Amino acid sequence: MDTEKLMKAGEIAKKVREKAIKLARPGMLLLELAESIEKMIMELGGKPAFPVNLSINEIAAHYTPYKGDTTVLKEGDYLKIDVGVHIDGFIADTAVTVRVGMEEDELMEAAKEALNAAISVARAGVEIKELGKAIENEIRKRGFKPIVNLSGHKIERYKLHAGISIPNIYRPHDNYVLKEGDVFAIEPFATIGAGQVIEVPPTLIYMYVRDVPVRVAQARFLLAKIKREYGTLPFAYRWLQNDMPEGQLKLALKTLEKAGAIYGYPVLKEIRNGIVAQFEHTIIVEKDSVIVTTE
Amino acid sequence: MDTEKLMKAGEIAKKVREKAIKLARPGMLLLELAESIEKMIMELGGKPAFPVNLSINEIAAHYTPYKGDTTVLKEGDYLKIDVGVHIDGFIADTAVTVRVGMEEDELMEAAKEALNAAISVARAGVEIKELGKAIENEIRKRGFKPIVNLSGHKIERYKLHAGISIPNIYRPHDNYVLKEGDVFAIEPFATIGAGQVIEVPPTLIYMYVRDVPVRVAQARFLLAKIKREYGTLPFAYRWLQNDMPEGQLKLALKTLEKAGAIYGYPVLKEIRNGIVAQFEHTIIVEKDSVIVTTE
Numbered sequence A, B: 001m002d003t004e005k006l007m008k009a010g011e012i013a014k015k016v017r018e019k020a021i022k023l024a025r026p027g028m029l030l031l032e033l034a035e036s037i038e039k040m041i042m043e044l045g046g047k048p049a050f051p052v053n054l055s056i057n058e059i060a061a062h063y064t065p066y067k068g069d070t071t072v073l074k075e076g077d078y079l080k081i082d083v084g085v086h087i088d089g090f091i092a093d094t095a096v097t098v099r100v101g102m103e104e105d106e107l108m109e110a111a112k113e114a115l116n117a118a119i120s121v122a123r124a125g126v127e128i129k130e131l132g133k134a135i136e137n138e139i140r141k142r143g144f145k146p147i148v149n150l151s152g153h154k155i156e157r158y159k160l161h162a163g164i165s166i167p168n169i170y171r172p173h174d175n176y177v178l179k180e181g182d183v184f185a186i187e188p189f190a191t192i193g194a195g196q197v198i199e200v201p202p203t204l205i206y207m208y209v210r211d212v213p214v215r216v217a218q219a220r221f222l223l224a225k226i227k228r229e230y231g232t233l234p235f236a237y238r239w240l241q242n243d244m245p246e247g248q249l250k251l252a253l254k255t256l257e258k259a260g261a262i263y264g265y266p267v268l269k270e271i272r273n274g275i276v277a278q279f280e281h282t283i284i285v286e287k288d289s290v291i292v293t294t295e
């Protein structure tokens, strides 16, 4: 409803993402990197739209450190930094892949070019299948495979994944027409593996879905807290770690997940352990072009 | 508006579908089969929602005979019969695979069970991803591959493919939640091939997409007929082969395509030419269950 906040969120997302790239040096602790970016988001005037994802190599997405994580970056690691910022619910979602301490390679170039190719065809009145075809052709002509179950997505106020997605493959019936004012995150994922991700432990990210009558008090009040503190945007297990002892925390989240009150987003790994590269920008559809808010 | 028109469309689609199975015998002309099915739809009181698709073996979908087509069913052929009926815009979309002159096999069973699995979990409140998972699990545990770029779809009045899809694979962000009153066609495709379909000539089905000024007169009268008789639902090239000679028809159709008035839907073939099996039903989502309009 207001492009000013979408542009502000995008400007902030761009700034933090570019600083995150500078911090991604061999030896950097992931936890330290994550907290710096999220603090930087704060210091600039926005709130995180979701916890910063730092996904290494075959880990495609949904990895955000936790208090006690000793993972450090290593030279040669294909680190995907996925950052989201929101200004009053208006979101900017962007991502880049850095090969730690090294230079970009062909796998990375395929994902980045696929993104450029989809932005180039996007405008009001274009069918989503057109973006999908653009993305897939760029990835496949370079000898890589697109990830079929991870895609771009429509973004609405306080709703990161609005329902309509922009696949990284051409689907003949993806006939949703981009409308003026539509906000979408386009995110090609390329890999040398099979082209599919699966969920694996641990679950570091969750999202509130519904108020469920939970009996045990500890879980009942956590839902209430999650509810008004995070609302409908994804939150990290890390964000709740100092609020209560880890043991009961894990139990409460489980109880809430088992009752269907919140849903967990387990780490996503490429099925054949193939390295995954990803690039992403958020766009606002205009009549004849698109505005890339995170560029 | 009314679940009654939806129920009515489904009853006719089922009857017609059950008749088509009986006629799928060796030596049957696809053209004879398509014409009989479509005439029966009209005899029963409905109008085709799309032309009867008769897709054999590696041809996954979008094949509908044309006048002069000599294709006949051979014993052993995996015939996918996809039929749709509408009653004043309210659609029933259903499909079955028959191994011509033979009994059902594991490939067909996987697709069928995948469908039954998705339906058993569907009800208001469930995210689309849960249906994707159910489908993918039944196809994969039997050793086959779900088709990644062909899938189920939300159905709206006079809109066969409404935007929201139900994939045959699990995607973690398919979080559209089924709502009471939603109408969807669940359609698992399974194959022994790679699991992906590509577009190949000919284009035997088209669909009116936008009201554009046509400079040519026969193209303009043609578009007038399309808008008048088919509206926004797909139509077969076959349905127009009598209005004007082939050459005039081809050129008028190309002018309309270039003008952006209609969109062509080429035949879909499994990329590694693997046999494709498909089953499909239309469902109306209820509070605690679903009505399968096409059973």
Ligand SMILES: [Co+2]
Binding pocket: A082, A083, A084, A093, A094, A095, A185, A187, A280
């Ligand atoms: Co992102």
Ligand SMILES: [Co+2]
Binding pocket: A093, A152, A153, A185, A187, A280
């Ligand atoms: Co995204």
Ligand SMILES: [Co+2]
Binding pocket: B082, B083, B084, B093, B094, B095, B185, B187, B280
């Ligand atoms: Co169908």
Ligand SMILES: [Co+2]
Binding pocket: B093, B152, B153, B185, B187, B280
């Ligand atoms: Co269908």
